């Protein structure tokens, strides 16, 4: 050990440290500076950025031996605090740069380092700086972060007054549609919002820290578990196995389709008879620290009989394949789509036909914050779980039978969380922590490292697809045929539903009267499927939007004009036979057209012999809702202090559940003149908030926004005074009148898609958009650079523009990754951010352009649709179409790795 006397955030610290200890651990654990966020732990994400003697360093890869006596360190806590915000923090809030907020401290500290060395950076200087310092963001697409740095710099430079970094209320007083900052922003930009790992550090002594004993093969029969060496190791309390589970030790898919061949009870909590994928949790070590638990987990010995593993859909679907779940065929679900007339004769007599085979793979979510959860037994006898769940009520029912609790004896709460992008539509760690809390009686905390986040959370499910179009010479679509095979890994939850998405979205955007297709879901031993932003659309629409360009090529037609010819207009129906609710695609195409033509001309002018430029188009469509007559509930309550609490379980991945609540409520409450800062939101809790439903399917703004609107309308009625005006809390309580008022809303016009035909009216609101990608391909290396993305978006009406702009930029960036760099195929190589192709700032163009072409929705609150998943529906198709425009080569199987593009260029 060594004494080091240094200054941290301007205050002398008399530190006692191991010279080999990591600065991140010292700052977070010894000094309580949990504003230093840790994600990857490998120097790749920048979340742990601190200033050390004028240099921005990653604290997770800086050992204390590198910190000199008398060193100066600054963390986010030294940049500024609530009510003493630095210009960078104020700018972040104003520009909406904190979505999940997990990267915000690190970007802000890094930016202070930049501005201390270059007071007047260009936007490119800012981008170069964040590239060099490895500041990674998965939510924002980087543009808002650069915007914030530039604004702060202007203020620090005296070019602009600091008051201009503070939001100015619009003249109309309306926050609906405005850039009003989100309530959680201040906490996020000051490092004072506690995420799950932060909470772990602040839990009491005697909290047990868990480590997973995980399968290191992909498929096996388990013969035994020996914990004897582990029990002797430092700090170890006990080891938990399936024998300690008090219920069924299975997670239920809950809404497993009747025509699924499996019962939906396939997924264990702790493996008992079998390993089904690499990473499966076989045991939990409980210890006094994460470090001691992990060390001991390495000594637990599992005796396995390894089995041949099926690592792709086609392998597992072979007629000869051995059943992974004995008694259930590996191909456990099929969904037909049968619209209109038989397609065979139409293809035979059509002027033109096209066909393609396409692939979209196992995209990894890559939030900056790896999975983390904790649980404890309450003083009331219930088991409490606090996690990254984005469907607390859903997950309660998925896990309660398995853990052996009745639903009223378990409570799930959503912690503040650093992104999910859908992986948390699935249970991950909740059942594990519940079992351990129940077995020990003690609080327990489980933090995944980044390798576990990659290997042992669910993934976008790969689809192998064949799609065909028949059309007239004038471009009018006549018929479509489709086939898709969904590799869902070993756990069935929502796999049938994901497969149904192919019937709904392959070919969406156009009038196609005649469709014959079939989706099939297959169990494999690769990573299990969890929702990933777009949930079936990125697969489906990659195929159909690439195939539209192939059709245009075969006709000698411009691909934007081919889309214009076929786009939904009154009278048309979507693939499930339902009429669209608004018709904005022609409007959006007409408004895009001159920008597309100019982009084509620029690409022609600026292309060189070696660097070929191209422009690509695609359409995106997706539902806002879960299928059928989805519903939500909210409670609007006048509090004694005159504030109003809007109680919901609107789960916040980081997308803006807080501001969606406040903005929607504000608009609904305008007759009573309620200031936005007087409106409070509630963190999701299954005991004390209503069943608003999960934040999946881009649904909350529509479903919960409507429930909030109704609850607020009902509160206004409850407060109305005879003769005009409104009663105060005191007046209502004195008259023994209610102050907490319910509202509910149901999408009553919706119906589930049929099991035989796929036809129905699954959503009452959809999101519609048109993408344009501008790219450059280096034909010597095959490397593609995306120079610009544009989204024409019809969101009906904006609840909050900081929220929607940010959602779109973030989705576009994930689309660039999906197109060019991302996959989870190689269990070890793709288990790091850099290994799996995470998009760092230079991969995302500064030119991300949005044009809102909003057609108010009949059933949306104040006309709103969702936004969340729209920007990932097909940006990757636009990008691949742009590579084709540039070079003549078509990549059918994502991602467009440089060598793959080169091979195609040279064939």
Give catalytic residues, as residue numbers: 869
What does DSSP assign to residue 182?
P
Query: Least distance to a second copy from the beta carbon of 2, Å?
Result: 6
Q: Is 454 in the site for Na ion (CB under 5 A)?
A: no
Q: Is 205 in the site for a second copy (CB under 8 A)?
A: yes
Q: How far apart are CA 890 and CA 853, in angstroms?
A: 31
Q: Determine which residue in the list 183, 356, 419, 782 makes contact with ligand FES, applying CB under 6 A.
A: 419
401 binds, among ligand FES, Na ion, a second copy, none (CB under 5 to 8 A by kind): none
Which position among 17, 208, 619, 864 is part of the footprint of a second copy (CB under 8 A)? 17
Residues 366-395 that bind ligand FES (CB under 6 A): 368
CA distance linking residue 514 with residue 345, whole number of Å: 11
451 binds, among ligand FES, Na ion, Cl ion, none (CB under 5 to 8 A by kind): Na ion
Strand partners, 447: 372
Q: Which of the 8 DSSP states describes residue 323?
A: P
Cis bond before residue 895 (omega within 30° of 0): yes
Q: Give the nearest distance from C-beta 4 to Cl ion in angstroms.
A: 45
Query: Do the annotations mark residue 12 as ligand-binding?
Result: no
**Own/partner long-range contacts of 380-383 (Cβ < 8 Å, ≥24 apart):** 381/409, 382/408, 382/409, 382/410, 382/411, 382/687, 383/409, 383/410, 383/411, 383/434, 383/437, 383/438
Cβ at position 94, least distance to a second copy in Å = 21
User: Is position 137 annotated in a ligand binding site?
Assistant: yes
Task: State CA 71 to chain mean position distance.
Answer: 39
Q: Based on the shown chain and the rule CB under 6 A, indicate whether residue 526 belongs to the binding site for ligand FES.
A: no
For a second copy, the closer of residues 254 and 377 by Cβ is 377
Q: Where are the alpha helices (DSSP H) in 556-699?
A: 559-566, 585-606, 657-669
Q: Are β-strands 848-852 and 444-447 bridged in parallel, bridged antiparallel, or unpaired?
A: unpaired
Q: Is 869 annotated as a binding residue?
A: yes
Report if residue 671 touches a second copy, rule: CB under 8 A: no
CB of 14 to a second copy, least distance (A): 6
Q: Shortest distance, CB of residue 27 to ligand FES, whole angstroms? A: 11
Say if residue 48 carries a ligand binding annotation: yes
Is the Cβ of residue 21 or residue 834 nearer to a second copy in the bound state?
21
The minimum distance between CB 223 and a second copy, in angstroms, equals: 33
**Please, which residue, 44 or 312, has the CB nearer to ligand FES?**
44
Contact flags string 662-691 toward ligand FES, x per CB under 6 A: ------------------------------
Distance between CA atoms of residues 712 and 770, nearest Å: 35
Report the residue from 92, 257, 384, 463 that binds a second copy according to the rule CB under 8 A: 384
> Is residue 835 part of the contact set for ligand FES (CB under 6 A)?
no
* Sign of the dihedral defined by the CA atoms of residues 877, 878, 879, 884, in that order: positive
For Na ion, the closer CB: 178 or 451: 451
Q: Is 286 annotated as ligand-binding?
A: no
Distance between CA 110 and CA 857 in Å, rounded? 42
Provide the mask over 407-446, with x wherever binding to a second copy is found by CB under 8 A and - wherever it is not: ------x-----------------------------x---
Q: Please, what is the end-to-end C-alpha distance for the chain in angstroms?
A: 62
Q: How many other C-beta atoms lie within 10 A of the C-beta of residue 301?
A: 14
- Is residue 16 at the binding interface for a second copy, with CB under 8 A as the rule? yes
The reply on whether position 54 binds a second copy by CB under 8 A is no
Identify which range of 81-89, 448-456, 554-562, 618-626 contacts a second copy by CB under 8 A.
81-89
The number of residues making up the chain comes to 907
Q: Which is nearer to Cl ion, 203 or 904 (CB)?
A: 904
Residue 100 marked in a binding site: yes
**CB of 790 closer than 8 Å to CB of 592:** yes
What are the tokens at 347? 């293809």
Q: Which stretch binds Na ion (CB under 5 A): 26-34, 282-290, 326-334, 604-612?
A: 26-34
Q: Does 142 bind a second copy (CB under 8 A)?
A: no
Q: How far is the CB of 12 from a second copy (least distance, A)?
A: 8
Nearest to 698 by CA among 581, 854, 873: 873
Report the partner that residue 342 touches, choosing among ligand FES, Cl ion, Na ion, none (CB closer than 5 to 8 A by kind): Cl ion
Give the one entry of Cl ion, a second copy, ligand FES, none that residue 344 binds, where binding means its C-beta sits below a cut-off of 5 to 8 angstroms depending on kind: Cl ion
Mapping DSSP onto H, E and C, the string for 389-451 reads: CCCHHHHHHHHHHHHCCCHHHEEEEECCCCCCCCHHHCCCCHHHHHHHHHHHCCCEEEECCHH
DSSP string, 48-99: TEEEETTEEEEGGG-BGGGS-TT-EEE-HHHH-BTTB--HHHHHHHHHT--S
Residue with smaller CB distance to ligand FES, 189 or 480: 189
Handedness of CA 596, 600, 605, 610 (dihedral sign): positive
Confirm or reject binding of residue 35 to ligand FES (CB under 6 A): no
Q: Which of residues 223-252 bind a second copy (CB under 8 A)?
A: 235
Residues 6+ apart with CB under 8 A from 692: 632, 633, 634, 648, 649, 650, 684, 700, 703, 704, 707
Strands 514-522 and 331-339: antiparallel
- Residue 70 as a binder of a second copy (CB under 8 A): the answer is no
Q: What are phi and psi of 821, to 5 degrees?
A: -140, -20
Site string for ligand FES, 90-129 (x = CB under 6 A): --------xxxxxx--------------------------
* Cβ closest to a second copy, residue 82 vs residue 344: 82
Q: Does residue 838 touch ligand FES according to CB under 6 A?
A: no
User: In this chain, which of 8, 23, 46, 506 binds ligand FES, going by CB under 6 A?
Assistant: 46
Mark the segment that binds Na ion (CB under 5 A) among 7-15, 269-277, 448-456, 834-842.
448-456
| Structure token digits, residue 404 | 């052996």
Does 40 sit near ligand FES (CB under 6 A)? Answer: yes
Residue 712 known to bind ligand: no
* Both structure tokens of 902: 């080169």
The residue from 25, 41, 805, 869 that contacts ligand FES (CB under 6 A) is 41
- Dihedral angle, C-alpha 474, 480, 483, 487, nearest 10 °: 70
Torsion of CA 230, 195, 129, 819, to 10 degrees: 80
546 appears as a binding residue in the annotation: no
Does the annotation list 661 as a binding residue? no
CA of residue 708 relative to chain centroid, distance? 23
Is 192 a residue that touches a second copy (CB under 8 A)? yes
The answer to whether residue 776 forms part of the interface with Na ion (CB under 5 A) is no
Residue in 48, 551, 661, 665 binding ligand FES, rule: CB under 6 A: 48
Is the Cβ–Cβ distance between 814 and 872 less than 8 Å? Answer: yes
Say whether 139 counts as a known binding-site residue. Answer: yes
Neighbour count for residue 598 (Cβ, 10 Å):
11
The CA radius of gyration of the chain, in Å to the nearest whole number, is 27
Residue 3 contacts a second copy per CB under 8 A: yes
Q: Is 571 in the site for a second copy (CB under 8 A)?
A: no
Query: What are the angstrom distances between the C-alpha of 796 and each of 47, 767, 781?
Result: 35, 8, 43
Report the nearest approach of a second copy to the CB of residue 13 (Å).
Answer: 8
Give me the residues that bind a second copy (CB under 8 A), please: 1-3, 10-19, 21, 26, 29-32, 82-84, 187, 192, 194, 199, 202-206, 235, 288-289, 291, 374, 376-379, 384, 386, 413, 443
Binding-site positions for [2Fe-2S] cluster read 40, 45, 48, 60, 100, 103, 137, 139
Q: Which residues bind Na ion (CB under 5 A)?
A: 29, 32, 451-452
Binding positions? 40, 45, 48, 60, 100, 103, 137, 139, 653, 869
Q: Which residues are annotated as a binding site for Mo-molybdopterin cytosine dinucleotide?
A: 653, 869
């Amino acid at each position: 050990m060594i004494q080091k006397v240094i200054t941290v955030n301007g205050i002398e610290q008399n530190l006692f440290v191991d010279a080999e200890a990591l600065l991140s651990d010292v700052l977070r654990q010894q000094l309580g500076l949990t504003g230093v966020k840790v994600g990857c732990e490998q120097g790749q994400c920048g979340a742990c950025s601190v200033i050390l003697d004028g240099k921005v360093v990653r604290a997770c890869v800086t050992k204390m031996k590198r910190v000199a006596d008398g060193a100066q360190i600054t963390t986010i806590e030294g940049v500024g605090q609530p009510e003493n915000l630095h210009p960078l923090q104020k700018a972040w809030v104003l520009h909406g740069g904190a979505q999940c907020g997990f990267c915000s401290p690190g970007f802000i500290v890094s930016a202070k380092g930049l501005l201390d060395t270059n007071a007047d950076p260009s936007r490119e200087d800012v981008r170069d700086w964040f590239q060099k310092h490895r500041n990674a963001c998965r939510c924002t697409g980087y543009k808002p972060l650069v915007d914030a740095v530039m604004d702060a710099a202007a203020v620090i430079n005296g070019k602009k007054p600091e008051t201009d970094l503070e939001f100015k209320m619009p003249a109309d007083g309306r926050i609906w549609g405005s850039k009003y900052p989100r309530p959680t922003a201040v906490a996020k930009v000051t490092g004072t919002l506690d995420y799950g790992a932060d909470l772990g550090l602040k839990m009491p002594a005697g909290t047990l820290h868990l480590a997973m004993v995980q399968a290191k093969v992909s498929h096996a029969n388990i013969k035994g578990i020996d914990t004897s060496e582990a029990l002797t190791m430092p700090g170890v309390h006990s080891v938990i196995t399936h024998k300690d589970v008090k219920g069924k030790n299975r997670i239920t898919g809950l809404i497993t389709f009747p025509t699924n061949k499996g019962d939906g009870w396939d997924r264990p909590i702790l493996c008992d008879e079998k390993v089904f994928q690499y990473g499966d949790c076989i045991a939990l070590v409980c210890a006094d620290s994460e470090a001691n638990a992990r060390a001991a987990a390495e000594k637990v010995k599992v005796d396995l009989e390894e089995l041949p593993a099926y690592m792709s859909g086609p392998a597992a679907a072979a007629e000869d394949a051995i059943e992974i779940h004995p008694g259930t065929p590996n191909v456990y679900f099929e969904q037909p789509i049968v619209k209109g007339e038989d397609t065979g004769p139409i293809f035979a007599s059509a002027d033109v036909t096209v066909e393609g085979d396409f692939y979209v793979g196992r995209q990894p979510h890559m939030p900056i914050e790896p999975d983390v959860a904790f649980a404890y037994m309450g003083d009331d006898g219930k088991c409490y779980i606090h996690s990254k769940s984005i469907g607390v009520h859903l997950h309660l029912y998925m896990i309660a039978p398995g853990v052996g609790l009745e639903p009223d004896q378990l409570v799930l709460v959503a912690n503040p969380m650093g992104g999910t992008f859908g992986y948390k539509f699935s249970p991950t760690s909740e059942a594990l922590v519940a079992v351990a809390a129940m077995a020990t009686g003690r609080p327990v905390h489980l933090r995944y490292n980044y390798q576990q986040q990659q290997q042992y959370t669910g993934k976008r499910s790969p689809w192998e697809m064949n799609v065909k179009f028949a059309a007239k010479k004038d471009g009018t679509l006549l018929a479509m045929e489709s086939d898709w095979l969904v590799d869902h890994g070993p756990y069935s939850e929502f796999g049938d539903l994901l497969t149904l998405r192919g019937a709904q979205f392959i070919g969406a955007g156009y009038n196609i009267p005649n469709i014959r297709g079939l989706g099939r879901t297959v169990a494999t031993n690769h990573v299990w499927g969890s929702a990933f932003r777009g949930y079936g659309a990125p697969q489906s629409m990659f195929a159909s939007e690439c195939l539209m360009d192939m059709l245009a090529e075969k006709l000698g037609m411009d691909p934007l004009e081919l889309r214009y010819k076929n786009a939904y207009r009154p009278g048309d129906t979507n693939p499930t036979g339902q009429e669209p609710e608004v018709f904005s695609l022609p409007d959006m195409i007409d408004q895009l057209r001159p920008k597309y033509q100019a982009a084509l001309e620029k690409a022609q002018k600026e292309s060189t012999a070696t660097h070929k430029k191209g422009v690509g188009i695609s359409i995106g469509v997706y539902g806002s809702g879960l299928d059928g007559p989805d519903a939500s509930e909210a409670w609007a309550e006048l509090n004694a202090d005159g504030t109003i609490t809007v109680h919901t379980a609107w789960e916040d991945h980081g997308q803006g559940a807080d501001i969606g609540c406040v903005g929607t409520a504000h608009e609904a409450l305008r007759p009573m003149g309620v200031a936005p800062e007087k409106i409070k939101f509630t963190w999701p809790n299954t005991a004390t908030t209503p069943n608003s439903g999960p934040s999946g399917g881009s649904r909350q703004q529509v479903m919960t926004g409507n429930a909030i609107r109704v609850a607020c309308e009902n509160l206004l009625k409850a407060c109305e005074k005879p003769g005009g005006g409104y009663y105060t809390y005191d007046e209502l309580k004195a008259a023994d009148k209610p102050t907490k008022i319910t509202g509910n809303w149901t999408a009553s016009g919706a119906t589930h898609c049929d099991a035989v035909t796929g036809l129905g009216k699954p959503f009452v609101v959809y999101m519609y958009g048109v993408f344009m990608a501008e790219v450059t391909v280096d034909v010597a290396t095959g490397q593609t650079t995306v120079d610009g993305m544009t989204l024409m978006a019809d969101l009906g009406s904006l609840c909050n523009q900081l929220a929607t702009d940010g959602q779109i930029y973030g989705g576009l960036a994930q689309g660039i990754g999906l197109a060019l760099s991302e996959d989870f195929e190689d269990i070890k190589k793709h288990a790091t951010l850099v290994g799996a192709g995470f998009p760092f700032i230079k991969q995302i163009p500064d030119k991300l352009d949005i044009v809102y072409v909003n057609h108010p929705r009949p059933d949306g609150p104040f006309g709103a649709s969702g936004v969340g998943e729209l920007p990932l529906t097909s940006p990757h198709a636009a990008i691949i179409n742009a590579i084709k425009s540039a070079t003549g080569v078509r990549i059918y199987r994502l991602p467009a790795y440089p060598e793959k593009v080169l091979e195609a260029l040279k064939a």
